[PDB]
Structures are given as structure tokens and as C-alpha cells.
Curated annotation (Swiss-Prot), chain A:
CDD domains: beta-trefoil_Ricin_BinAB. This is Binary larvicide subunit BinB. Residues 172-421 are annotated as: Probable pore-forming domain. It comes from Lysinibacillus sphaericus. One of its GO terms (biological process) is sporulation resulting in formation of a cellular spore.
Curated annotation (Swiss-Prot), chain B:
Residues 1-6 form a propeptide. The keyword Disulfide bond applies. This is Binary larvicide subunit BinA. The lineage of its organism: Bacteria, Bacillati, Bacillota, Bacilli, Bacillales. Pfam families: Toxin_10.
Length: 421, 367
């Protein structure tokens, strides 16, 4: 099954934005020369308007349908400065991405779609302000937002200063989405001395993937210009595999204590936060911080992992289990739990980092000799040794039989204290 | 696998099962009960197996849920001081947030004309007697707002069709071959839509029991517009339709609360606004960025055969179609929901090695 993340056309191309009514080809520019218009002062941060040195801008889609406007050459975004100009206007300036409201813009299309003569406008503050050229149509000037909105059906003269069309473009760098695959059965040991399959050698199944706009990714290896041109979107893969918890020979008719370490450590969580502003909730759902929050829904939809419903962070889980071997022989037993793996890749395929969370809720056992020679292993005692939160303080009702190769779902078993009461 | 293939299914998402709820702290067996009348007060009543006590949580794009009962399909509606049952209209007071304090217990919160501000949770005023559900600002370390699921019954969802590759352009067999009226229809995508958001002759209460989920299917195909045998160096004028008819737009809007914009993006009404992101993602469509609706337009176009030999030419336009289906697969809409887009056209020709027709001038007919 192939995959499509469904980005709009304008979110896949860096476009040159020209004014619809300008006669001499004026548009959004990165010209070094200052503003030629009296009441329109320019500076180092000012977004310029000129017929030379065009800007090539991408529009990253936010979950609420608004856009982040970024520049291909320097990787900075458009920003509505809180400072005031004449007539209660705000300058539009270049700034680094922060994810604040002042960096979000609403695109509104209007005009004659039937003759292909439509145009678009950018609005802010719940459509109370429209982006406009300062005073001129065909002269070098600045860009600002005004609260003086005019009708669009008879396109006032002032409305012309707000009308944009798409011109030339550069393709963004989009990585290819991998194809999904099925999860294998829990691996069987081949002999008494076979210690099983370790995580490094475990076969992965691809279940999801999302395209992360470079602005939310912290990749120290690249500068913001190389990052925006060659790695506009990073690839975040979601995979699953059987992560071994322990492998041991259990002597005939013996009870043995085994520690089971699952979940995720704080250091790994901190790492994901640092790089992506993302981390795992105690229900194994996804949680987000400020800088990536605006894209949560698109990301999760792509990953096929749900949004978390708790505020509790997943942590390290240490449990002590007692098992009983009822066979008359000594047996090689091995237990695996479901691993949820997240991988960040660059457009070229280079792996940036991996993060693994071990889901103790889905686990199974395999043995040598196998069934029907041997009888299944039995859980006779379950104790929680160390866990920093009480999201899941439940233990299994013992005794519980672990049938070879069968997956045991903690939520479908009888627990103490009882759930679903 | 086969079994493990359904490993994702073992731990289900909120809207894949029917539940029975009770407040964790109640000692006597009280369950959350909805009134038999379409409108009324939500109450804790002695637990029984009646459909008044069974609920489905329909999830939305941001994770909030719509809570409908199995008896009549009326939803949880926040009011002044109490929670009432009422018909779903897509009102802001009909969206709730489920917060899991633990793996087994959760509370229901509603939010004001505010954002981060007054999140209040649902709470009964008694454990000993039947009570209405009230609001409280006392959330932290308060177990009285804590809810548990007494029962959980897994829903069998309809089988959705497999996604197909973009439709290919039809081929002509000879000089006299006009070609097929349409190409093979291609499944681009399909999405699940709660029964409470659709228009149908079946009662809401019945839909809740037999078809709680409907699904919308999105297909693409090439539609024939014209066909002619062009003599060498001849210019002909052909008429090409575009957009959507007034009846089709009205039928679609009435049926699924979704309209098509002038930019060919989709416009979502009050009922479907909260699920627009999931809808467009599943169907591979886009949300509209204009307020103008798509209308029907008739275009004339000049086509010139530049080859020194006669050529057969058939013009096709890209057609996009939406169909509403019940859980049993039956199609609900009787009127076709089709949008033709004259910006994407393909010209099928005989002989195959012949060039593309030269496009001249385009006019718009004001019939």
C-alpha cells in the first residue's frame, strides 16, 4: 500500500509572488536598495517590493488551514511586527521561526476563476487586517498589514495593492514515502543454546510516515539555507518490531524471578523534545510542544499513531515476574514485547536519529523445544518494582498462561485492581 | 500476518466501540442514562441494558468527541448549568474532551468562549440517588469527576475499497472509433462519516444500531466531451462543459453538509466542520480557500489539425465524483455528485503518432 501525505500544490513549491495589477512586473523582493516612497520607511528586516531580485516563498500548511511563509534563500519566515507605522499599520518583517500567532497568515482567494483571472490576499488577526504594498503599485516600496479593508467585487484602487498571483517557482525537496508492511510472528528459538533475536537484528514493519517542515526540525549538521533548499521536509518513519525482554533456560518444574524493563527513558524523551518538540504519552499516544503544535493533526494522521489523551509522560517501567515451567525437561524460553520505533531521515536517506518506546501491553513467549512437545509457561506472580507515575498501576491476575506465539493484550486480561468496572 | 495484521485493532481507538459509563466513586450501580425523548436531561439511573445507557464517542480532527446515545442518536449538549440531550447541529457546546487520568479512569471536559481558561468537568451531585450532570472547576485530585467504562462492545466497521492509481487516458482503435463515453473509474480514496452528519430516510436511532458509520467514496475518471474526424489543416470549434450543476451542488450540500468551492476545494458546513482534516486526508482532496461556489460553465474552443493527413480526435475532461454509502454498501444519493474540471483535459487520437491539436481561442457561452 503506497502513501500520499496530501500537501497542497503551494506547499510543495517555492513561488515568486507578483502583484496582479502591476504593469512593470513588481512583486515580493529581497532587493538591497531602500524604499523610494516618502511615507514608507524600510530597513534590514523589511520585506521589500520591487521588480528585481524576486523572493521564492513556500507556504507550510497549518492544521487550521493558515500558512507559514518561508524564504528559500535564508530560511526565515514572514512576521507581523507589533510596532506601529503611519495610519496604525504594521510592517511585515523577516524573522526566525517561533510558531507565534504573528507568523501565521490566512490566504483568501477571489476574482474570476472562470477566466483564470483569480487572485489572492493574505489576512491576519481573524481577517481584521490585510497585507498591502505601501502606497505604490509600480515602485520599490515595503510590505505592511493594514486595518483599512475595502470591497473586492468592485476592486477599489486600494484593493489592488493587496492582490497577488503565482509566477515562477522552485520545487521543494520532498522525500519519498516508504511502503507499509506487515508485522512478523514472534521469532522462535531453534535450539537450547539459541538466545533469540536481538533488537539490532529484529525485522521492522513500516506502519506510518509524516513529512515534517524543516522549520520545526533541529538538525545542527546543516545551516538554515541548506536545510530549506535541500531538506525542505524531513521524513519521520513509524515502525514496529518484536523487542526481546529476556531469554533464559528454565529448569524442569522450577519457579524463577525475571525482571522486565519496558517503556522509555527520560533521556530518550528529552532527545525527541529537543529535536522535534515531540514525545510519548503514558497511553503511547503523541504529545507536542509549542514549536510543532500547529502541525500535530497532519503529522499523526500520516504516522497512524493517535494523539495522546493524557498529560502523563511515558517513563521507565520495571516489573518483576515469576514464571513456572511445568515440563519434565529444561526449556529455552524467550519473551518479546512490541516496540514502537520512530526514525528521522533527511531527503537523501541519511538517518538523523532513532527513538524507541517498548509497549509492555502487547507481548508474547516462544520456546525450544516448541509446542506440542512442551506445555506453555505460566505467570505465577507479578510485581511493579519501579515506575514514576500511576497511570498504569495494574498487575495481572495470577496464574496466567502464556501460550507459545500468542500475543497477550494487558487490556483484555483480568487485572488487579479491576478495570472496566 | 493474518492475526497480527489486526495487532493495531487489539487496543481500539475511542470511536470503534459502544460503551456503558458509570462514575468511579458511586457504590451503587448507577449508569449514565439518556432520555427517551429527543431532548431532555442526562441522568444517572440504575444500570440496565437499555439503549438509553449505550453511547458511541465520535472523534473529530482535534481529538474532541461527540457523544451520541444508541436509542435515538441525540448527543451530549452543554447548557447553562447542566448537560442535556439534544439533536446534533454541530454547535460548539456539543464537543467534549476526554482526559485520561489513568489507564482505566477518565473525565469529560467542556470548554467556553475561552481556550485555556474555564475547562470544567462533568460531575454528579449524588452517588446514592439519580442525579443530573453538573460542571466543576475543581479538577486536580478530584475523583468525583472520574468515569469508568462498565462495558465495551466492539463495532464491526464496513469494508472500505482499495485505493487505485490515477485513471489512464482512453485509446482509440481506428479512424471511426469515437471511443468510450467514460474511462474506468478509479478509487482515489474513501472516508468514514458518523451517521449523525448525513441525510437519509432511516431514523437516527435505527442508524445508531445498524449503520453508525456511513462512508464517502471518491472516484476519478475521464468524461467524453466531443469527437470528430479532422480533415488535414482544418479548424473546428468544440463545446466543453465545466464545473457542477446547481442541482448536484444542492443535493451534495443537503446530503453530507459539504459543498465544492470555485477553486475545486471543499467547503464544510456546521455539521462536518470538525472532521474536515480527516475527510480531505482520506479522500486526497483539499479544503477551499475561497467563499465563491463552483457553478456550471460552458466553453467553446478552437482546435486545429496541423497534420497533412486526416486525424480522429476525442476530447476528454477529468471528472471527480462523490458517493454516499451505508454500512451495508448501498448507495444513498440518487442524484450524481460530479464536478467536471476543464483545466485537466486529454485528447485521444487516431493514428496514435499524430500530434496534439493546436489550441486557438476560448470563449464562454452565455446561454
Amino acid at each position: 500500500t503506497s502513501l500520499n501525505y496530501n500537501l497542497p500544490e503551494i506547499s510543495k513549491k517555492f513561488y515568486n509572488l507578483k502583484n496582479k495589477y502591476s504593469r512593470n512586473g513588481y512583486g515580493l523582493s529581497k532587493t538591497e536598495f531602500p524604499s523610494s516612497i516618502e511615507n514608507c520607511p524600510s530597513n534590514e528586516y523589511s520585506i521589500m517590493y520591487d521588480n528585481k531580485d524576486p523572493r521564492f516563498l513556500i507556504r507550510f500548511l497549518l492544521d487550521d488551514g493558515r500558512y507559514i511563509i518561508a524564504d528559500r534563500d535564508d530560511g526565515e519566515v514572514f512576521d507581523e511586527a507589533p510596532t506601529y507605522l503611519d495610519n496604525n499599520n504594521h510592517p511585515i518583517i523577516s524573522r526566525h521561526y517561533t510558531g507565534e500567532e504573528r507568523q501565521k497568515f490566512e490566504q483568501v482567494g477571489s476574482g474570476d476563476y472562470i477566466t483564470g483571472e483569480q487572485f489572492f490576499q493574505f489576512y491576519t488577526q481573524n481577517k481584521t487586517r490585510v497585507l498591502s504594498n505601501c502606497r505604490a503599485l509600480d515602485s520599490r516600496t515595503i510590505l505592511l498589514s493594514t486595518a483599512k479593508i475595502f470591497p473586492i467585487y468592485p476592486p477599489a484602487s486600494e484593493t489592488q495593492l493587496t492582490a497577488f498571483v503565482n509566477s515562477s517557482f522552485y520545487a521543494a525537496a520532498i522525500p519519498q514515502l516508504p511502503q507499509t508492511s506487515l508485522l512478523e510472528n514472534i521469532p522462535e528459538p531453534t535450539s537450547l543454546d539459541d538466545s533469540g533475536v536481538l533488537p539490532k537484528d529484529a525485522v521492522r514493519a513500516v506502519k506510518g510516515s509524516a513529512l515534517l517542515p524543516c522549520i520545526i526540525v533541529h538538525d545542527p549538521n546543516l545551516n538554515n539555507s541548506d536545510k530549506m533548499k535541500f531538506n525542505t521536509y524531513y521524513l519521520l518513519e513509524y515502525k514496529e518490531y518484536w523487542h526481546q525482554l529476556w531469554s533464559q533456560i528454565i529448569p524442569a518444574h522450577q519457579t524463577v524471578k525475571i525482571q522486565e524493563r519496558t517503556g522509555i527513558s527520560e533521556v530518550v524523551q528529552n532527545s525527541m523534545i529537543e529535536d522535534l518538540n515531540m514525545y510519548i504519552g503514558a497511553d503511547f499516544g503523541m504529545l507536542f510542544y509549542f514549536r510543532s503544535s500547529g502541525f500535530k493533526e497532519q503529522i499523526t494522521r500520516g504516522l497512524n499513531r493517535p494523539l495522546s489523551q493524557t498529560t502523563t509522560q511515558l517513563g521507565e517501567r520495571v516489573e518483576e515476574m515469576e514464571y513456572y515451567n511445568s515440563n519434565d525437561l529444561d526449556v529455552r524460553y524467550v519473551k518479546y514485547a512490541l516496540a514502537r520505533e520512530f526514525t528521522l531521515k533527511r531527503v537523501n536517506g541519511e538517518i538523523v536519529k532513532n527513538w524507541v518506546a517498548v509497549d509492555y501491553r502487547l507481548a508474547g513467549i516462544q520456546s525450544y523445544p516448541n509446542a506440542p512437545i512442551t506445555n506453555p509457561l505460566t505467570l505465577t506472580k507479578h510485581t511493579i518494582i519501579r515506575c514514576e507515575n500511576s497511570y498504569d498501576g495494574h498487575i495481572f491476575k495470577t496464574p496466567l498462561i502464556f501460550k507459545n506465539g500468542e500475543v497477550i493484550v494487558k487490556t483484555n486480561e483480568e487485572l488487579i485492581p479491576k478495570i472496566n468496572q | 500476518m493474518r492475526n497480527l495484521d489486526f495487532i493495531d485493532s487489539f487496543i481500539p481507538t475511542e470511536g470503534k466501540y459502544i460503551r456503558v459509563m458509570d462514575f468511579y466513586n458511586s457504590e451503587y450501580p448507577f449508569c449514565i442514562h439518556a432520555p427517551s425523548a429527543p431532548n431532555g436531561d442526562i441522568m444517572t439511573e440504575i444500570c440496565s441494558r437499555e439503549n438509553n445507557q449505550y453511547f458511541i464517542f465520535f472523534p473529530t480532527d482535534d481529538g474532541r468527541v461527540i457523544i451520541a446515545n444508541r436509542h435515538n442518536g441525540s448527543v451530549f449538549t452543554g447548557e447553562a448549568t447542566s448537560v442535556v440531550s439534544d439533536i446534533y447541529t454541530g454547535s460548539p457546546l456539543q464537543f467534549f474532551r476526554e482526559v485520561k487520568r489513568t489507564m482505566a479512569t477518565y473525565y469529560l471536559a467542556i470548554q467556553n468562549p475561552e481556550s485555556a481558561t474555564d475547562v470544567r468537568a462533568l460531575e454528579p451531585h449524588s452517588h446514592e440517588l439519580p442525579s443530573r450532570l453538573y460542571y466543576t472547576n475543581n479538577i486536580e485530585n478530584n475523583s468525583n469527576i472520574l468515569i469508568s467504562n462498565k462495558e465495551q462492545i466492539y463495532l464491526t466497521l464496513p469494508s472500505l475499497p482499495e485505493n487505485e492509481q490515477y485513471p489512464k487516458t482512453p485509446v482509440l482503435s481506428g479512424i471511426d472509433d469515437i471511443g468510450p463515453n467514460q474511462s474506468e473509474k478509479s478509487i482515489i480514496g474513501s472516508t468514514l462519516i458518523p451517521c449523525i452528519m448525513v441525510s437519509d430516510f432511516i431514523s437516527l436511532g435505527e442508524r445508531m444500531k445498524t449503520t453508525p458509520y456511513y462512508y464517502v467514496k471518491h472516484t476519478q475518471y475521464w468524461q467524453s466531451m466531443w469527437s470528430a474526424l479532422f480533415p488535414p489543416g482544418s479548424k473546428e470549434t468544440k463545446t466543453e462543459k465545466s464545473g457542477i450543476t446547481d442541482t448536484s451542488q444542492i443535493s451534495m450540500t443537503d446530503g453530507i453538509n459539504v459543498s465544492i468551492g470555485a477553486d475545486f476545494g471543499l467547503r464544510f458546513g456546521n455539521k462536518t466542520f470538525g472532521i474536515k482534516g480527516g475527510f480531505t486526508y482520506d479522500t486526497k482532496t483539499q479544503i477551499t480557500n475561497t467563499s465563491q461556489l463552483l457553478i456550471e460553465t460552458t466553453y467553446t474552443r478552437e482546435y486545429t489539425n496541423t497534420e497533412n493527413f486526416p486525424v480522429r480526435y476525442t476530447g476528454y475532461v477529468l471528472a471527480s465524483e462523490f458517493t454516499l454509502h451505508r454500512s451495508d454498501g448501498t448507495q444513498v444519493n440518487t442524484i450524481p455528485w460530479v464536478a467536471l474540471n476543464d483545466n485537466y483535459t486529454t485528447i485521444a487520437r487516431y493514428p496514435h503518432f499524430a500530434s496534439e491539436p493546436l489550441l486557438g481561442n476560448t470563449k464562454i457561452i452565455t446561454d
